[PDB]
Design a protein around this ligand. Sequence first.
Ligand SMILES: *[C@@H]1O[C@H](CO)[C@@H](O[C@@H]2O[C@H](CO)[C@@H](O)[C@H](O)[C@H]2NC(C)=O)[C@H](O)[C@H]1NC(C)=O
Ligand SMILES: *[C@@H]1O[C@H](CO)[C@@H](O[C@@H]2O[C@H](CO)[C@@H](O)[C@H](O)[C@H]2NC(C)=O)[C@H](O)[C@H]1NC(C)=O
Ligand SMILES: *[C@@H]1O[C@H](CO)[C@@H](O)[C@H](O)[C@H]1NC(C)=O
Ligand SMILES: *[C@@H]1O[C@H](CO)[C@@H](O)[C@H](O)[C@H]1NC(C)=O
Ligand SMILES: *[C@@H]1O[C@H](CO)[C@@H](O)[C@H](O)[C@H]1NC(C)=O
Ligand SMILES: *[C@@H]1O[C@H](CO)[C@@H](O)[C@H](O)[C@H]1NC(C)=O
Ligand SMILES: *[C@@H]1O[C@H](CO)[C@@H](O)[C@H](O)[C@H]1NC(C)=O
Ligand SMILES: *[C@@H]1O[C@H](CO)[C@@H](O)[C@H](O)[C@H]1NC(C)=O
Lengths: 292, 292, 525, 525
Amino acid sequence: QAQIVHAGQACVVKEDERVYTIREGDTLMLQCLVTGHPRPQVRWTKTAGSAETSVFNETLRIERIARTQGGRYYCKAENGVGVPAIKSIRVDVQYLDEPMLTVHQTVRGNFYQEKTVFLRCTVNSNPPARFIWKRGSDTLSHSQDNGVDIYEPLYTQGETKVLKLKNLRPQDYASYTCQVSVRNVCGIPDKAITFRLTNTTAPPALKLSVNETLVVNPGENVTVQCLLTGGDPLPQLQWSHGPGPLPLGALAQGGTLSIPSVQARDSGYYNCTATNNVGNPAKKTVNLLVRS
Amino acid sequence: QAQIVHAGQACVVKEDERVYTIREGDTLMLQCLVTGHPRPQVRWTKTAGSAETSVFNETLRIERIARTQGGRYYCKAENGVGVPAIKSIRVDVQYLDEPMLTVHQTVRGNFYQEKTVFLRCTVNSNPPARFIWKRGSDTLSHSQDNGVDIYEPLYTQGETKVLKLKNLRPQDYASYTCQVSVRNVCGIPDKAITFRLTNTTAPPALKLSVNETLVVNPGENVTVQCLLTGGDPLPQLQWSHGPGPLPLGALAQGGTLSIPSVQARDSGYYNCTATNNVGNPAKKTVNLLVRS
Amino acid sequence: PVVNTAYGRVRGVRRELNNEILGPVVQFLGVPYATPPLGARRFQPPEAPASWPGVRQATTLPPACPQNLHGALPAIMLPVWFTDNLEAAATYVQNQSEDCLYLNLYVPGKKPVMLFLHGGSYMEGTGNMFDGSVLAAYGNVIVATLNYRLGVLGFLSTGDQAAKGNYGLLDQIQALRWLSENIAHFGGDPERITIFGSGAGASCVNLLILSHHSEGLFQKAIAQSGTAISSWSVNYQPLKYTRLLAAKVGCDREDSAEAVECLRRKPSRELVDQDVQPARYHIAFGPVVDGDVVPDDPEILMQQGEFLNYDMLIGVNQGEGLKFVEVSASAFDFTVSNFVDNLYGYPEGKDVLRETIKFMYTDWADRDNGEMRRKTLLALFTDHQWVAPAVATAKLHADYQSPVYFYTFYHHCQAEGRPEWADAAHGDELPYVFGVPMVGATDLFPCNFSKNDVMLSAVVMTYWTNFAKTGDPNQPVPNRFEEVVWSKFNSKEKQYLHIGLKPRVRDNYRANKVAFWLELVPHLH
Amino acid sequence: PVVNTAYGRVRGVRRELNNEILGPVVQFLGVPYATPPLGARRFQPPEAPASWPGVRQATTLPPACPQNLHGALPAIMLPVWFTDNLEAAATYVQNQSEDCLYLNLYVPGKKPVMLFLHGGSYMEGTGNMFDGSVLAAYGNVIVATLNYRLGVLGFLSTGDQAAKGNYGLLDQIQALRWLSENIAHFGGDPERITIFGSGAGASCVNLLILSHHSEGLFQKAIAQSGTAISSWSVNYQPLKYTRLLAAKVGCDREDSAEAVECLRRKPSRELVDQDVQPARYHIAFGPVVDGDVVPDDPEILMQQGEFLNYDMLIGVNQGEGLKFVEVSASAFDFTVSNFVDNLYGYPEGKDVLRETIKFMYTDWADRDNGEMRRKTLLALFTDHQWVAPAVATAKLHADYQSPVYFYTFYHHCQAEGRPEWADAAHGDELPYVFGVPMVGATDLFPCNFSKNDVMLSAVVMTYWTNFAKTGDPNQPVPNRFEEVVWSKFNSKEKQYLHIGLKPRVRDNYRANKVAFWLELVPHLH
Ligand SMILES: *[C@@H]1O[C@H](CO)[C@@H](O[C@@H]2O[C@H](CO)[C@@H](O)[C@H](O)[C@H]2NC(C)=O)[C@H](O)[C@H]1NC(C)=O
Ligand SMILES: *[C@@H]1O[C@H](CO)[C@@H](O[C@@H]2O[C@H](CO)[C@@H](O)[C@H](O)[C@H]2NC(C)=O)[C@H](O)[C@H]1NC(C)=O
Ligand SMILES: *[C@@H]1O[C@H](CO)[C@@H](O)[C@H](O)[C@H]1NC(C)=O
Ligand SMILES: *[C@@H]1O[C@H](CO)[C@@H](O)[C@H](O)[C@H]1NC(C)=O
Ligand SMILES: *[C@@H]1O[C@H](CO)[C@@H](O)[C@H](O)[C@H]1NC(C)=O
Ligand SMILES: *[C@@H]1O[C@H](CO)[C@@H](O)[C@H](O)[C@H]1NC(C)=O
Ligand SMILES: *[C@@H]1O[C@H](CO)[C@@H](O)[C@H](O)[C@H]1NC(C)=O
Ligand SMILES: *[C@@H]1O[C@H](CO)[C@@H](O)[C@H](O)[C@H]1NC(C)=O
């Protein structure tokens, strides 16, 4: 004598069955309807592993749903008459983050005449994103300009796509844009990111104003500089310590690391890294040591 | 002072560099020309492994060349003045044997509704042959009739090609022809072979007029019959003994095996096989034993 | 031995086992757990059974569900002992009626419950073949064997609302509810219920793991050589074969409710005798994606984490698919061709897939003889149908912190045509699970049991019952297995227990082949 | 120590080795075996040398052929010891002149002859780096080291008749003729001549096996980590790179004879200093298919059986391509991408090939860390460039009843940056072939030699010299190698000898990978 049907007439995105497809952050509301000769109990349970995280009202409402809240739900009528009623919904919470473009020249010697450059684009999106590569305002492919390849590498779960420039022609040194699209499933618009490849594009190189292992007495003033010796797109520099952070230490500019006073707690490694998405980041280490 | 150039103006087939391309069995003749201030020695050597199989006349002539004589040759001037002269030719002896068509139904139970039939064609040709499958007078492919596949299996050196009939439709029971072509390189014309697939096409089954192990006393008259219990294309039957043949034994018809007198030499196995190219051949064994 | 239930009173029967160490048990053969699905209730979910005022005498095996073992059996996916001993199996199904929704209990302070979902191929079998009395008297556990609706009467679906399908699974759920609110009368524990099955029954086990209707019914699950993601696990063309069968029995009406309506009139004898041939390695009538008891595709459900954290014990035998091989190079090419065309939907690129599969399953140290070709075919079917889906299921469930324990059965039982040097085929783990070596070879399992068989049977029974008790197969009750710790299974380590005469725990089973079928073959097409 | 030859008289020099067991040798450093190819004879075959009436004093190493080690070396295909010790190598080539066609003899009743074709990459190297006196005094064999024309002056070709090419190979043939009709004066045997080389030199060895011009010159051959079918074995775009180089030196004329004509005027210093970058894993100037000294494609020649039954001793090191790897998953994807695009001509289907290659070289028991990725890259390049072409050559030659003996070098020599736990890289077998451990570490081979190194060096020298004598590497003169019978090699058994500290004879080396590259990868595209 216990039946249930739920309406999904909330502020949810439209599409031209059993799936509730909403844009991320939008307001979700699902209306469970019961039917019984005795008044049955309502339950809105999220499928979470267990051999009270459930809303017991007829309406399951969440104002701001993230990816974490995009599992499978189901409502249930507990009425003593017969089998309890169960109806399930897959809440598909969709989004489209911002793309990340990184150049990779993969170089020692210059013995071969190849000059090959890779452009890897990466996104995070609930709908598997569609990738469109452009050179300026030219959506390019291999059938259009055979000097390039385009492929999606396996074992990366399809969240990335690579544009290969096999041999750099003068026309290759241009502006490339990765444009990612979810096909406007929730009205989510396409995004894009751009990189300028030029004759001087190169990964970063770092210069350290101290030796590798820096020996310091307690109470002294320590200042280490991180200097740049390479990287055409202006690299960004950051310092780090590792296991235990230091309260005295400050990093006013990305290059300057400052420790006002030194105690044996402050000993250890201090890694300065420069990262401009062109190659492997540059890492220079200062092994700060305090006598004892 | 020793130079050589050879003309290939023999009865050799025409083509629209260094290769002498002749039809098999035709007459080959190659004319080596020497040049020396002293009269140099001529040599027509076939490249055969060695850390006198050579013609020492200016003309290398072979009336009937088979596949075995289609290696690489080279002529050489031995003159004391300087380096001896060497010029090589690849003698490409081409042919096209006759195709062999065999059906393979790959069957136990009839639990699945598949009814899949394979048609394997096999040839032996110096030019890798081209295969054309036909159903009656219809050169068929997958894009024409998608109820069939056509593929060339690897690890068979490309001398065979398979026509797959995935699910037998009423129109599949027809006449299939494998037509193999060398593209008339030496004027060699295309060949063909045909098979009629019908509702009753089946591999052969054999009935033996004796038990498995037949015990016989010396000097007796032995006659074993090989009978057919299956095989829509009329199978052909043959007997065999194995290691040592028997002079007394005769095989007037493929089914009848006759041993006039028996000695202990005649003991052993006698395998009758029926082979019509539809499945695995049928093998029935008579273990003829002589008391001692 | 009379016990009252919420419906009626039942008289059992106490029997002594053929073992001097194992004592007696109390059997309840044929208690009804659902109303007979006879008229309007054919092709309908199972409701609660009736109530009888007197004492029903359940001292005889109940009838098996309507079957047909005469002609056209799925020997490829059937247990080998079943296909070899069709007579000793047919004696168990001489009594067939559509009123077959009964179960059998085997009882030796709340004892754990262990219900066995018998498998095969969804169109045959019965729980009466499995005498759980030995497993009960050894394990200190209650053993249940039910009978669910088979084939047409159990899984016919139209993809519409006329016949949602999965009626046999719903019978299993109804028996789970029955035991949840009636095993306490037998002294059992409704809070320590464990289901276990082999073959298609283990497929049903995983399905009930993914189902909502089994929410409070059981806690542990054991899949033995069966998965919900294999080709024959779920029917994805229900209306096709339902309309073929309907056309066979003069029931082809273009309205699904009307065709279902005439199908309810035709007698079960004339429905089960019809043989609707399915596609190769598929099924014509089985579990379907109704959107209710199976919310969506089981693989999608396991990838999206839409399930509960049951305790899973998965495992595969070494040489399952023995019936698949019973080799010429040409024959190898042909069976790989039909393999690719049937298991991959005749895909463009079937040549690449076929040739790389023939390469991957060809030991190149000797590529000449056909014995090795037979071995690589056995490994081919064993890997694609059982090993890879098992590892994928254990991985996906273990990723969401479900405790999983993986086993590989290597030692089998010696019978005629089944020499002890051959591989453990499909279904050969059941004799050790049900303590068959300890009571003598039945006519269905005519094995030359040795002391090793008995001891190994005690080991695996110990593992299974321990799992039913505590969720760890080796914790309650611990002579080759010395201090072997059946470690857990997670996607990092992927550790499994190698069950057999020489046991050990290894880290990655067939990792190259599993990664081949899982991570590379899909991109090909 | 003066000996007369058919051309002139030569004064040698006797030297004692740095070993108390090995006695003295007689060295003849710098005897001319061909007329200097200076003016009209540049880009021309080598003719017989001149005759000197007096006694030429060949007691000093002759000059090396024009090279350039300043900038842009092929570190990928070069021996590792060469790339690491560029100074100790550059000291051997301080004297460079185009008149470099000389050779060096090392002599301890007709002794066997063993000429060493030095390799590298066809554009550098010299026979002066290899002091064959130790190998001579140990093996009871005469050891020869020549200098053939390198790079531009040795292999420039136009594909036309203007420059057929393969001039360095023709220099090697001219030295073979010289030794065939002049080693008898040194007591040597012209009927037991064996050529041996490493790297590109071994490529030249196989080429001379396939050549007609070497018909009566030698009987045995030894290919050490070099083959005629690898990507860098033969140049297949000679006119392309010849026209690039011509454009560099202001010699671009659309007539090949005129461009060759101006190229003969430009000094060698301005030609060898030009760096014409080739395609990845290829060469810009090397052996070509002239149709004369190389009648056709070497692979076609070996498939059609168009060669003579020389005795071949092939073999590969375990970890060749060490320079190739010096790993991120992304980097793995990228280097496999360039691998496929360069070694397979940017083929349609590069995605299938790339992904199946990344699968085939990925241990899936742990696919997380990059150490294993480095190992699988090393195995990738080692397999594709050296192991598979070696096995293919040994198979094709052994099929036509050529006696072949296959070896795999596993133990290497310990140097800085080359720990003894790493794999035997490319060229690390030469120190043991030339008895380096028995005379101390030279500056070019700065190895921490141990007693194991000396003894293994004696073992491999014993094998090589025995092969030069009788064609069986273990028959004349037989402490780990106990009764090990270096069995033959045929396509059936494919047996090889595993040379190292722990030796054994095994039947199929990397059979799955070799069968992958040989029998499956071609069908992909
Ligand atoms: C800064 O760089 C140092 C490099 O010296 C890092 O130290 C490494 O830590 C890993 C962690 O297991 C060890 O395996 C390596 O052996 C260490 N390198 C050494 C000792 O030379 C340190 O972790 C870095 N700190 C960061 C990135 O915060
Ligand atoms: C006739 O058939 C018999 C089958 O009994 C063949 O005998 C087999 O020979 C092979 C050769 O090594 C053995 O390995 C088998 O064991 C034999 N089978 C036995 C003993 O049952 C016999 O070779 C056949 N003769 C032919 C084909 O000429
Ligand atoms: C390319 O960059 C180089 C410096 O790296 C510069 O000398 C040259 O002019 C550039 N080419 C242009 C701007 O066309
Ligand atoms: C260290 O530097 C800080 C700020 O730069 C300053 O306040 C402090 O006095 C210095 N320590 C000394 C001088 O000992
Ligand atoms: C097909 O063959 C069967 C016998 O195998 C026969 O009964 C039937 O008539 C045949 N179909 C035709 C001739 O169309
Ligand atoms: C055996 O048969 C042959 C011919 O059939 C006959 O000549 C011979 O006499 C027979 N042997 C007897 C009857 O002993
Ligand atoms: C089965 O019988 C065979 C021989 O008849 C015997 O060798 C084997 O040991 C037996 N196996 C047992 C008793 O387990
Ligand atoms: C090389 O030197 C190291 C330590 O300095 C030593 O352990 C090793 O045994 C040496 N190898 C030899 C002497 O062969």
